[PDB]
């Protein structure tokens, strides 16, 4: 139940449960959990100091740091046993040197639609991508929508939430531009037919996930994510150029963080404008965000005056 | 592997054998951190130099009361330290803001600001429980690099 | 020097702001006994003579306008 | 009386009363109290209009240095219909007296500062306005000492609480670090502490 | 004109006082600093507490004055309760507060010759200091900060010792300020350093309202330490130094004569105590005894009703001001008639001492002002006032 | 002598008679006041009191003694602000009677 | 009233004065926004220092307008130079603040009437 100002040290009835947590997307939803107060129980995987930054966002006693694997049971049974909500957002990008990494996307969603569900929990809410369709492309794109429907057995209504693109401060897709200080600046690929995908803001997505959080009845109902005016040109990657004027790694260096010269280059050049039938930002409100306006703050270049 | 987990017994081993602090002195517990500078508890040469510029440190102290005007600044200096950094702050008005708590005006924490790792109680530690928070600190560090990346 | 080229550059002040005129250019917007402004709004319109054309508003006079005429009226002794 | 009681003198007593006395003879215009301290203190309530002469007066003289100005400090009082009350404190060099000002004023009625008298009056006077909002007159440089630069309590004076209503936060939500309103962990439990039954005899009020 | 700020910088010294110079080419001839970073809440704290209760926050105030502080608290309250302390008492607070200005100057030195830039004159004098903590901690509760000196006179008797100790220590300490005085008066480059700068010696030195050193040093004869009584304080013989002209070299060597000074007075102060008490005998004010506050009846009512509330003090206002180690120590003492206390205004040195740096700086080198500073002996927290 | 004891002056030049221009001057000045406030009664009481004492006689360390100031240099300065004194009472008028009185229970301590 | 003013004299040294340094803001907005390095758009601080003007206009007695002159005009000295480190002056601005509801029946399910 809840009680008083939810300024900070309130209460607010609610038990959140994020697991990843470490990159872009999951850091700053639970920033905005612990300034209403709540109970967030975050676990990570291997990592002590990489949650260091992550503390001063939650007060007092309202955050708390458990270990798990994944491929594990137990580990992700017994931190969920006291909870009321629990939303997933793990993943990554390419494959690693000793994974699998399809079934990551089946049965790690999987092994948190176990007991977990049947312990009691409500309004489970996975992540999705606008661009993950059954079709044969690609090895990353597709092979999400393996787990959009597969996994979709279990926890017969999610609310599983659909974003499109995304754009903030430290992502990879908006940080894929300019950071290709190179011998020739080439556009994906040298077309302009394309571009763009619908670039929605950091504060939206974390904005939707609270609305939604009690919503209520927003389970099984699930929802697109809006972007900008309108679709989007060719004109980015020039207004890249234009404006800017042309993490337990390891102790040297990571023998491969790449470019990755393989399905990467294409997983983005796919579009997709997906169904407009999905209610699913606007009614989920309100998410209202340009381009034009938060583009100044994530570019940072050498000029940095004029 | 044996091969690779050898390694870091030296990297891990190193950072914790040589730490450039910097001090920030604002109130009564500068001064005892002050006797331990002095060579009674000679703080120098037990794995640790001396005061050192702002560039180049690896272990932060707030040491004293911290006021809204100093908020600010305090930020600015933790940006611009490198990446394994470490914050401890002694003093117990660097926990709570010992007592000064209910004023107008006093910091409540040098937590909701900074995230700190170990906390000395007491106003002025007694330059005795302080290099006994510093052997903490040494022995917190059993971390590792390799199976890291060895593992995801 | 010509006392019709201050008459061109007042006369596209006040709608070059986007607010409460609508295109009435006429001389006779007697701001805020015809035209209806607030009283800050004013001082707001005084603003643009010092970046078009260049001007100075030393005085009480931006108090004493009221009207666009006075404006190249107190521009015309100004100029010619 | 005994061992243990302060032993109190009377020479100092005596020309204490003696020299305040003809103080308010050579001023009828500005001094409207005069009172002795039963331990060897004086003050001269002044209406401030003679805020300026009577220490010009005080500022020299040959029977009365007094060029040592030790003491600017501002009390509020509630519940007198005018509120504050500047308090001086000056001392003889020549002479080893310590004597005070008392002048009384209101919020918003101004005073005419100190600044051609005295200057070590340079960051006292400014601290009032900064902590009361009195304004003093004609002084060179007012600014904001001693407070943060957001504040718009005033905050010594009784209506502003404990803590103020600003406590201060980080997040990561972009850089910033952001006010919030203000919210404690603990209440700080307010006693009850006036024990009744009246220990002083003296000070006894008038019984209406 | 540039418009550095060499302050924020944590440049040794003491990071803090964070000031702008409007410096004309390599001149300065304007300054302003800025103050308030540690502002506390302290005067508006105090209006909550009782007497007993408010009084470490006085302790706190320096740095360094542990028994100079709590000096001027006790004394401004026993004045407004009728009570002179008992004898014995008062030959421990002279022992004591003339044993913390062999503490400020100390530190005035070494911390002024470490800005300059000197090493080893700060190791070689806090290593002898710490044979003077150890005093502290054998009398009161702690390292520095002890809430030892009460309304009611002294807290306990200090223990079996501390006289066969005070005089082995004071022995053998006028061999440690004879190390100085080679280190740094037979100097000529540290005199070159420090020669004709900051020379104030008009009556604008005096209008702008400075205490001690930072006066008489420079020329006016005039000090509270024997125009002014405290306790048996006149009783014992010393004379207070002068220097020649108004400038910082001539307000150091103030300070090693002060030094020689306090040693004369402790060697004074121990042939001249004689047995008795502790506390103040009527004990309205002081609780009783330990072996007393189990027995009778009349201890308990008297003891727990002390810790609940304080005292009763009567109204009207009372001010007074002692010698602390770097100046005058103003605290007007606003009393209402209860258990706690009104309006409790300090003056603490600083605000006249630092204020003066205005006309003392211009004319001069930036080089110059780190210099000026550490000679003022100013110490941030205390300019809380 | 050559320093005047108090750094910030110096002996400038002549004793026993700088004094008595300038007790003198103020005696003819004083003479312009109306004579109703008793300002007067005492400061030219004092003053005949002193340039009695002050005119004419060696030396100048028995003039120190029975006229209490500090050195003889000093003691232009204890008189030389008090003709600036003195001339700024003509301006303003303490001998005027009080004003603003005020309003009946102000200056009663406890509450 | 038996109390000597400030500056003004009755309304009229007083609401010229008002009007007077809001040019002095009005051109300091556009200055200050690529000084202080951070990135809204100039035509919110516009309407945010008319906000502040407006909301006071219900004064009709001078020496209070004339008492917010020297509050007003003391904003200015941190303002054309640099004291304001990079958040006081986006302290004008509740921005991270959770919104208020102000509204009866969106009070009644959250709040014991605050
Ligand atoms: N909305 C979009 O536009 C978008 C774009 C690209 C990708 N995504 C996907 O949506 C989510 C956004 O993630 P992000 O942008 O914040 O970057 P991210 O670094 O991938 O964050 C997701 C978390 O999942 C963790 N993780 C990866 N593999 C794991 C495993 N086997 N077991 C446990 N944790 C694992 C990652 O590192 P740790 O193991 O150290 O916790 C990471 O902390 C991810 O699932 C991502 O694949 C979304
Ligand atoms: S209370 Fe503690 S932190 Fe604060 S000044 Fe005293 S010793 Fe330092």
Same mark, same amino acid.
């Given at each position: ?19 990843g947590a ?21 676990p ?8 260091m930054?992550?503390?001063p ?16 049971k137990?580990?992700i049974?017994?931190?969920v ?34 007991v977990s ?7 489970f ?29 279990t ?10 693109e ?16 190179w011998?020739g ?6 077309l ?19 609305n939604?959080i ?5 389970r099984?109902k ?5 972007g ?21 790694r390891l ?17 983005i ?9 999905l ?14 306006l ?6 940072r ?6 | 592997?044996?091969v690779?987990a ?9 950072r914790r ?8 002195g ?7 951190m ?6 009674? +508890? ?5 794995? &640790? @130099? ?11 102290? *707030?040491? #004293? ?33 010992? +007592? ?5 005006? &006093? @910091? ?7 995230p700190?790792?170990?906390? *000395?109680? #007491? ?18 560090i ?11 | ?14 709608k ?5 005129d ?7 917007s ?23 054309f260049?001007?100075?508003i ?13 404006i ?9 | ?32 109290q ?32 007094f060029?040592?100005?030790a003491?600017?400090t ?8 005018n509120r ?15 004597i ?27 601290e ?10 004609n ?8 407070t ?21 936060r980080?997040?990561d939500?972009?850089?910033?670090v952001?006010?919030?309103p ?5 209440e700080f ?20 | ?13 003491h ?86 200005r ?5 530190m005035?030195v ?14 070689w ?23 030892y ?6 807290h306990?008797?200090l223990?079996?010792?501390?006289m066969?100790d005070?005089?082995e ?9 004879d ?13 070159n350093?420090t ?6 010696t008009?009556?604008?030195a005096?209008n ?13 004869q ?6 002014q009584?405290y ?77 609940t ?8 206002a ?15 003492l ?8 009104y ?14 740096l ?5 004319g001069?080198?930036?080089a ?18 | ?43 030219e ?66 509450i | 009233t ?9 309304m009229?040294?007083?609401?010229r ?7 002095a ?17 100039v ?33 200015l ?25 102000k ?12």
């Amino acid at each position: 139940i809840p009680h008083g100002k939810g300024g900070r040290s309130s209460v607010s009835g609610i038990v959140a449960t994020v697991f990843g947590a470490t990159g872009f997307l999951g850091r700053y939803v639970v920033n905005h959990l612990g300034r209403m107060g709540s109970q967030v129980i975050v676990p990570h995987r291997c990592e002590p100091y990489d949650t260091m930054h992550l503390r001063p966002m939650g007060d007092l006693g309202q955050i708390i740091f458990m270990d798990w694997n994944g491929r594990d049971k137990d580990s992700i049974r017994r931190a969920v046993e006291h909870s009321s909500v629990v939303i997933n957002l793990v993943g990554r990008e390419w494959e690693t040197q000793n994974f699998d990494f399809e079934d990551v996307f089946v049965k790690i969603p999987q092994a948190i639609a176990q007991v977990s569900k049947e312990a009691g929990v409500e309004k489970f809410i996975h992540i999705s991508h606008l661009n993950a369709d059954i079709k044969s492309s690609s090895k990353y794109l597709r092979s999400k929508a393996v787990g959009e429907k597969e996994v979709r057995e279990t926890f017969p209504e999610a609310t599983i939430i659909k974003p499109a693109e995304i754009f903030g401060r430290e992502d990879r897709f908006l940080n894929y531009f300019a950071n290709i200080r190179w011998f020739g600046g080439v556009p994906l690929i040298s077309l302009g037919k394309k571009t763009v995908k619908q670039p929605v803001y950091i504060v939206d997505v974390t904005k939707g996930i609270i609305n939604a959080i009690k919503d209520p009845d927003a389970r099984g109902k699930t929802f697109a994510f809006v972007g900008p005016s309108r679709y989007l040109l060719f004109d980015l990657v020039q207004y890249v150029f234009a404006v800017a004027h042309r993490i337990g790694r390891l102790f040297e260096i990571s023998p491969f963080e790449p470019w990755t010269t393989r399905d990467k280059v294409e997983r983005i050049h796919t579009t997709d404008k997906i169904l407009p039938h999905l209610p699913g930002l606007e009614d989920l409100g309100v998410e209202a965000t340009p381009l034009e306006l938060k583009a100044i703050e994530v570019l940072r270049r050498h000029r940095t005056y004029r | 592997e044996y091969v690779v987990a050898k390694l870091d017994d030296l990297i891990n081993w190193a950072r914790r054998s040589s730490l450039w602090p910097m001090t920030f002195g604002l109130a009564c517990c500068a001064v005892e951190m002050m006797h331990m500078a002095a060579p009674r +508890y000679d703080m120098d040469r037990f794995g &640790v @130099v001396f005061r050192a510029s702002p560039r180049q440190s690896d272990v932060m102290i *707030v040491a #004293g009361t911290l006021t809204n005007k100093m908020a600010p600044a305090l930020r600015k200096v933790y940006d611009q330290m490198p990446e394994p950094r470490y914050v401890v702050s002694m003093g117990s008005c660097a926990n709570g803001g010992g +007592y000064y708590h209910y004023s107008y005006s &006093v @910091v409540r924490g040098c937590d909701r600001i900074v995230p700190v790792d170990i906390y *000395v109680p #007491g106003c002025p530690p007694t330059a005795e429980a302080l290099l006994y928070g510093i052997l903490q600190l040494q022995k917190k560090i059993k971390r590792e690099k390799r199976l890291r990346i060895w593992y995801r | 020097l010509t006392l019709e080229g201050i008459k061109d550059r007042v006369l596209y002040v006040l709608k070059l702001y986007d607010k409460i005129d609508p295109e009435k250019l006429s001389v006779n917007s007697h701001f805020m006994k015809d035209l209806g402004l607030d009283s800050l709004d004013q001082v707001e319109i005084i603003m643009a003579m010092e970046d078009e054309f260049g001007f100075e508003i030393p005085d009480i006079d931006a108090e004493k306008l009221m009207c666009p005429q006075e404006i190249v009226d107190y521009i015309a002794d100004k100029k010619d | 009386t005994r061992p243990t009681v302060r032993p109190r003198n009377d020479v100092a007593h005596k020309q204490l009363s003696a020299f305040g006395e003809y103080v308010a003879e050579i001023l009828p215009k500005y001094v409207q109290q005069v009172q002795v301290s039963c331990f060897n203190e004086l003050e001269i309530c002044i209406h401030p209009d003679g805020v300026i002469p009577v220490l010009t007066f005080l500022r020299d003289h040959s029977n009365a240095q007094f060029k040592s100005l030790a003491d600017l400090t501002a009390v509020d009082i509630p519940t007198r219909q005018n509120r504050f009350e500047i308090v001086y404190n000056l001392l003889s060099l020549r002479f080893n007296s310590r004597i005070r000002v008392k002048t009384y004023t209101d919020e918003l009625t101004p005073i005419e500062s100190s600044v051609p008298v005295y200057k070590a009056a340079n960051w006292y006077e400014r601290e009032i306005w900064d902590m009361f909002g009195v304004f003093f007159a004609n002084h060179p440089d007012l600014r904001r000492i001693l407070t943060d630069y957001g504040f718009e309590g005033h905050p010594f004076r009784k209506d502003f609480p404990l803590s103020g209503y600003v406590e201060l936060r980080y997040d990561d939500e972009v850089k910033r670090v952001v006010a919030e309103p203000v919210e404690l962990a603990q209440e700080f439990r307010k006693f009850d502490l006036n024990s009744p039954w009246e220990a002083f005899p003296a000070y006894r009020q008038p019984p209406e | 004109n540039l418009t550095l700020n060499f302050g924020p910088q944590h440049p040794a010294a003491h990071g803090v006082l964070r000031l702008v110079m409007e410096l004309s080419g390599e001149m300065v001839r304007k300054c302003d600093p800025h103050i308030g970073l540690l502002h506390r809440g302290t005067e508006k704290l105090i209006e909550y507490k009782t007497y007993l209760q408010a009084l470490p926050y006085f302790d706190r105030l320096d740095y360094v004055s542990m028994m100079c502080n709590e000096q001027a608290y006790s004394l401004a309250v026993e004045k407004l309760l009728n009570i002179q302390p008992p004898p014995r008492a008062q030959w421990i607070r002279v022992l004591f507060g003339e044993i913390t200005r062999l503490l400020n100057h100390i530190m005035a030195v070494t911390t002024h010759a470490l800005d300059i830039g000197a090493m080893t004159p700060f190791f070689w004098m806090f290593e002898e200091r710490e044979k003077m903590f150890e005093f502290y901690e054998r009398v009161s509760g702690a390292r520095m900060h002890a809430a030892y000196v009460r309304p009611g006179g002294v807290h306990q008797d200090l223990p079996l010792g501390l006289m066969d100790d005070i005089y082995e220590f004071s022995k053998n300490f006028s061999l440690r300020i004879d190390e100085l005085e080679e280190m740094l008066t037979n100097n000529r480059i540290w005199r070159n350093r420090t020669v004709d700068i900051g020379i104030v010696t008009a009556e604008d030195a005096l209008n702008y309202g400075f205490s001690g050193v930072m006066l008489r040093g420079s020329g006016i004869q005039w000090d509270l330490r024997k125009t002014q009584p405290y306790d048996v304080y006149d009783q014992v013989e010393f004379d207070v130094p002068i220097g020649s002209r108004g400038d910082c070299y001539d307000r150091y060597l103030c300070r090693v004569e002060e030094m020689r000074q306090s040693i004369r007075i402790i060697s004074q102060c121990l042939n001249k105590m004689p047995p008795g008490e502790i506390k103040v005998d009527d004990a309205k004010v002081s609780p009783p005894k330990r072996a007393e506050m189990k027995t009778s009846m009349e201890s308990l009512i008297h003891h727990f009703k002390l810790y609940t509330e304080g005292y009763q003090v009567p109204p009207g206002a009372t001010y007074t001001a002692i010698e602390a180690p770097k100046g005058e120590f103003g605290v007007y003492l606003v009393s209402d008639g209860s258990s706690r206390p009104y309006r409790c205004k300090i003056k603490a040195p600083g605000f006249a001492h630092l204020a003066g740096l205005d006309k003392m700086s211009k004319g001069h080198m930036l080089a110059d002002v780190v210099a000026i500073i550490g000679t003022q002996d100013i110490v941030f927290g205390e300019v809380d006032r | 002598k050559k320093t005047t004891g108090l750094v910030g002056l110096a002996v400038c030049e002549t004793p026993h008679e700088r004094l008595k221009i300038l007790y003198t001057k103020i005696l003819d000045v004083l003479g312009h006041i109306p004579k109703n406030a008793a300002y007067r009664k005492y400061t030219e009481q004092i003053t005949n009191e002193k340039l009695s004492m002050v005119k004419a006689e060696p030396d100048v360390k028995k003039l120190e003694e029975r006229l209490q100031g500090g050195q003889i240099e000093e003691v232009i300065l204890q008189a030389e602000n008090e003709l600036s004194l003195a001339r700024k009472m003509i301006q303003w008028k303490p001998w005027e009677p009080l004003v603003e009185e005020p309003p009946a229970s102000q200056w009663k301590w406890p509450i | 009233t038996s109390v000597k003013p400030i500056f003004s004299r009755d309304m009229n040294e007083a609401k010229r004065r008002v009007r007077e340094l809001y040019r002095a803001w009005y051109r300091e907005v556009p200055n200050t926004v690529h000084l202080f390095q951070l990135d809204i758009s100039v035509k919110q601080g516009r309407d945010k220092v008319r906000e502040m003007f407006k909301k006071n206009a219900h004064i009709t007695d001078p020496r209070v307008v004339d008492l917010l002159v020297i509050k007003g005009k003391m904003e200015l000295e941190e303002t054309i130079k640099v004291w304001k480190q990079r958040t006081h002056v986006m302290r004008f601005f509740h921005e991270t603040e959770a919104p208020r509801p102000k509204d009866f029946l969106s009070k009644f399910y959250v709040g014991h009437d605050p």
